[PDB]
Amino acid sequence: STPIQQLLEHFLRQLQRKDPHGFFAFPVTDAIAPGYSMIIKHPMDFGTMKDKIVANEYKSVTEFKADFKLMCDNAMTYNRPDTVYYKLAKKILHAGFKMMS
Numbered sequence: 001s002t003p004i005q006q007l008l009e010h011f012l013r014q015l016q017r018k019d020p021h022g023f024f025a026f027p028v029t030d031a032i033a034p035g036y037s038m039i040i041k042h043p044m045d046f047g048t049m050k051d052k053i054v055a056n057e058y059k060s061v062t063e064f065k066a067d068f069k070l071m072c073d074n075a076m077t078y079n080r081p082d083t084v085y086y087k088l089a090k091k092i093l094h095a096g097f098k099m100m101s
């Protein structure tokens with residue numbers, strides 16, 4: 001693991017702690033959420049981010065932050081504000097960006 005992979009693995013562990021039930025652990029498919037692909041063109045989840053750290057695909061912390069922000073933005077676009085999905089995405093987006101700053 002390079003120094004960048006080490007820092008990103010730390011940030012991912014800290015972010016995943018805020019999601020104990022794994023709401024963000026897997027890719028959201030149309031079978032799971034009807035019409036998802038018609039609303040969300042670039043899906044993102046913690047599992048895909050973990051594979052990118054392991055494959056050394058993040059050249060900077062900025063790229064990792066963009067995937068994290070995309071995952072949360074997708075949840076806040078597809079889900080209504082009264083839902084658990086939206087509230088958790090908004091809470092983790094703020095906490096996550098505060099922590100990595």
Ligand SMILES: CCCn1cc(-c2ccc3c(c2)c(C)cn3CC2CCNCC2)c2sc(C(=O)NC3CCS(=O)(=O)CC3)cc2c1=O
Nearest residue numbers: 021022023024026028032033075078079080083085088089
């Ligand atoms: C949080 C952002 C990501 N994320 C995640 C889920 C979701 C789906 C299945 C889930 C879970 C969570 C959990 C904890 C367990 N499972 C079982 C799976 C686990 C993996 N292997 C298959 C079984 C949903 S579900 C939904 C929806 O149904 N949204 C509607 C909500 C009401 S609305 O009016 O907003 C229309 C959209 C929107 C999302 C969504 O964005």
